[PDB]
Design an enzyme around this catalytic site. Structure first.
Site, PDB file in Angstrom:
ATOM      1  N   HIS A 111     -11.345  27.114  -3.497  1.00  0.00           N
ATOM      2  CA  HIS A 111     -10.484  26.912  -2.333  1.00  0.00           C
ATOM      3  C   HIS A 111     -10.753  28.016  -1.311  1.00  0.00           C
ATOM      4  O   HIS A 111     -11.068  27.746  -0.155  1.00  0.00           O
ATOM      5  CB  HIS A 111      -9.011  26.954  -2.787  1.00  0.00           C
ATOM      6  CG  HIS A 111      -8.010  26.899  -1.671  1.00  0.00           C
ATOM      7  ND1 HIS A 111      -7.018  25.949  -1.574  1.00  0.00           N
ATOM      8  CD2 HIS A 111      -7.815  27.737  -0.621  1.00  0.00           C
ATOM      9  CE1 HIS A 111      -6.268  26.234  -0.501  1.00  0.00           C
ATOM     10  NE2 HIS A 111      -6.714  27.312   0.115  1.00  0.00           N
ATOM     11  N   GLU A 112     -10.677  29.265  -1.761  1.00  0.00           N
ATOM     12  CA  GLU A 112     -10.884  30.398  -0.870  1.00  0.00           C
ATOM     13  C   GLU A 112     -12.307  30.482  -0.336  1.00  0.00           C
ATOM     14  O   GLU A 112     -12.518  30.824   0.825  1.00  0.00           O
ATOM     15  CB  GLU A 112     -10.488  31.706  -1.563  1.00  0.00           C
ATOM     16  CG  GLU A 112      -9.021  31.766  -1.973  1.00  0.00           C
ATOM     17  CD  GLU A 112      -8.054  31.544  -0.814  1.00  0.00           C
ATOM     18  OE1 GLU A 112      -8.391  31.879   0.346  1.00  0.00           O
ATOM     19  OE2 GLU A 112      -6.938  31.040  -1.075  1.00  0.00           O
ATOM     20  N   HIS A 135     -13.054  28.507   2.707  1.00  0.00           N
ATOM     21  CA  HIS A 135     -12.488  29.048   3.938  1.00  0.00           C
ATOM     22  C   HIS A 135     -13.472  29.871   4.755  1.00  0.00           C
ATOM     23  O   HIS A 135     -13.335  29.965   5.978  1.00  0.00           O
ATOM     24  CB  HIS A 135     -11.259  29.901   3.633  1.00  0.00           C
ATOM     25  CG  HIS A 135      -9.996  29.114   3.483  1.00  0.00           C
ATOM     26  ND1 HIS A 135      -9.653  28.042   4.277  1.00  0.00           N
ATOM     27  CD2 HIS A 135      -8.961  29.279   2.623  1.00  0.00           C
ATOM     28  CE1 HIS A 135      -8.451  27.605   3.884  1.00  0.00           C
ATOM     29  NE2 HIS A 135      -7.986  28.326   2.882  1.00  0.00           N
ATOM     30  N   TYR A 167      -1.261  21.281   1.106  1.00  0.00           N
ATOM     31  CA  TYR A 167      -1.243  21.995  -0.169  1.00  0.00           C
ATOM     32  C   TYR A 167      -0.757  21.073  -1.276  1.00  0.00           C
ATOM     33  O   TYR A 167       0.170  20.291  -1.074  1.00  0.00           O
ATOM     34  CB  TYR A 167      -0.278  23.177  -0.124  1.00  0.00           C
ATOM     35  CG  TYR A 167      -0.747  24.391   0.636  1.00  0.00           C
ATOM     36  CD1 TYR A 167       0.141  25.099   1.442  1.00  0.00           C
ATOM     37  CD2 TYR A 167      -2.056  24.860   0.521  1.00  0.00           C
ATOM     38  CE1 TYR A 167      -0.252  26.241   2.112  1.00  0.00           C
ATOM     39  CE2 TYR A 167      -2.462  26.009   1.193  1.00  0.00           C
ATOM     40  CZ  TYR A 167      -1.547  26.694   1.985  1.00  0.00           C
ATOM     41  OH  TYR A 167      -1.903  27.838   2.650  1.00  0.00           O
ATOM     42  N   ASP A 187      -6.134  24.956   6.152  1.00  0.00           N
ATOM     43  CA  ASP A 187      -5.080  24.569   5.224  1.00  0.00           C
ATOM     44  C   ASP A 187      -4.116  23.576   5.870  1.00  0.00           C
ATOM     45  O   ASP A 187      -3.042  23.951   6.342  1.00  0.00           O
ATOM     46  CB  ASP A 187      -4.308  25.799   4.741  1.00  0.00           C
ATOM     47  CG  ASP A 187      -5.137  26.700   3.854  1.00  0.00           C
ATOM     48  OD1 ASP A 187      -5.696  26.203   2.856  1.00  0.00           O
ATOM     49  OD2 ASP A 187      -5.223  27.907   4.151  1.00  0.00           O
TER      50      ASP A 187
HETATM   51 ZN    ZN Z   1      -6.185  28.050   1.892  1.00  0.00          ZN
END
Ligand code: ZN
Ligand code: MAN
EC number: 3.4.24.20
Length: 167
Positions: free
Chosen positions: A117-118, A121, A133, A130
């Site tokens: 996920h990170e 980014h 979520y 984002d």
């Molecule tokens: Zn995020």
């Protein structure tokens, strides 16, 4: 390099980093061999169209070239509601928060999945945002706004975690 991480946290991160590398590797392979609509793809990225498939394929191709085990980790954040965070323009450093230590190494909303996920980014990897979520919201985003889904970090995380498993 680790910053403010205890021995247990370093050990957990080492395992999570390796698992995240595996997640990205398998995900990239999936995107390379599936060039038409499939359950796993549409559930997280919406209706299959070459343009968007190319977008996610690019994201994973970029993430696969990242060396997760060489990422710098920071364990100073103690936010219980946040898993982790990064600065899109500062590649290679991931900041872990409270929820990260309560998450399993692999699986849904896992430590390994959080790193995927990170990683998504980082601008070098596609610069995802984002917009949604959680699995429920991510699936809804895929159905309602696929363009954002392929640019949503959690949709990448869930596509990679693939739990429950889909073909
Ligand atoms: Zn995020
Ligand atoms: C994503 O949506 C597609 C519909 O085009 C299905 O093929 C798949 O099972 C998933 O629900």
């Amino acid at each position: 390099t680790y910053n403010g991480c205890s021995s247990s946290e370093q050990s957990a991160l080492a395992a999570a980093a390796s698992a995240a590398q595996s997640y990205v590797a398998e995900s990239l392979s999936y995107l390379q061999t599936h060039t038409a609509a499939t359950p796993r793809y549409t559930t997280w990225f919406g209706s299959y169209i070459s343009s968007r498939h190319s977008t996610v394929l690019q994201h994973y191709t970029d993430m696969n070239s990242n060396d997760f085990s060489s990422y710098s980790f920071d364990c100073t954040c103690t936010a219980a509601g946040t898993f982790a965070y990064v600065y899109p323009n500062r590649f290679g450093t991931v900041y872990l928060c409270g929820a990260f230590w309560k998450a399993p190494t692999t699986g849904t909303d896992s430590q390994a999945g959080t790193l995927v996920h990170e990683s998504s980014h980082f601008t070098r990897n596609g610069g995802t945002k984002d917009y949604a979520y959680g699995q429920a919201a991510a699936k809804s985003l895929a159905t309602m706004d696929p363009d954002k889904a392929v640019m949503n970090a959690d949709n990448h995380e869930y596509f990679s975690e693939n739990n429950p498993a889909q073909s």
